[PDB]
Every structure is written in C-alpha cells, then in structure tokens.
Amino acid sequence: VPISFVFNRFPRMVRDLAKKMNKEVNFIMRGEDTELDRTFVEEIGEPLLHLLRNAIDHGIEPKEERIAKGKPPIGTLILSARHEGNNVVIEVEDDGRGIDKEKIIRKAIEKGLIDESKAATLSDQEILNFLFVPGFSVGMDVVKNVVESLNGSISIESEKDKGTKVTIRLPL
Ligand SMILES: Oc1cccc(O)c1
16 A cells, blocks of 8 residues: 555644644655555554654644744654665654653653663663653553564654654565
8 A cells, every 4th residue: 555545644633633732733744655565554553643642742842832942933743654675664753842861761760670870871772762661651662562563663763852753664
C-alpha cells in the first residue's frame, strides 16, 4: 500500500487534538507516496498516532510561550516517510520544548534504576533509552512494543528547547 492510506487520516486527528489542547500547530506531511507491505500499514497507524499526540501535548508549546522564548510563534510537526535500502524510515519531528534529560535522570534515580554516580557519565542516548522502560513515563514502551512486533526499530533524539525526533525503521 502507499503509506498515505495511514497518513491521510492524520490531518484531521492532529487538527482535532490541537483544537482540544488549545494549541497552534503547523502540520506537514512528506513522502506519503512511500509504499510498503499491507501488514505494516494496518499496524503502523496507532503507534504513529501516539507519537503525534505526544508531540502536540508534551512537545509543542503554546504560541505565547514560543513568542516569549523567541521561537517562530506557531510550532511545526513534520511526519515523513522515505525508502532507505529495503527499509522504510518514518520520522515524527517537532520543534517544541524537547525532552528534559535532567528530569529523566531524577525519575530514574527515584525509581531505583541507577545511582547518582552512574548517572553523571550516561550518554544522551542512554538517558533517552529510559523512556522505553515499561511505564517509565508518554507511552514510549507501548510504541516500542508495536514497532518490535513489526520487526522494526525505534530511536529518539531530543534537545531541550530544540525539539524531538522519533524515527521508526521498518523492514521490507
Ligand atoms: O515532543 C515530544 C515530547 C515527548 C515525546 C514525544 O514523542 C515528542
């Protein structure tokens, strides 16, 4: 199928979520032509919807907050697909507040998963990996479990005030 069978439902959903959350969102879709196995298109919808929800809820800041921090007033959400080899790569990127890595660390210490000394030398990717720990947080463990049932991989990149990029790699 073209991935557009999934991507064509997101403009309405993002718009309804942005309206519910009183948030101004510039939503852009690219690579909707990208074709992949029907089993993927039937299952990739729900995980991508979760990621779009997360970006709009926890990521994108309200216009007035963006203006106070000197950002472009309306936040941007980009959903993309492309071919890489015999994989498909799907990206959800926002220019919102990003993931607070210091908050992750604090929570991880509170949950007994690491001590303060070990937290000081963690890389950014080991920190962000805490989000995939079942109910660490949102929902990144359940997104992971679906991608994994499709034999895909997922990664997250994030920087404070810069934004967040989640990338899903799928086989075929
Ligand atoms: O902007 C964000 C923040 C948190 C999780 C997410 O998938 C996106």
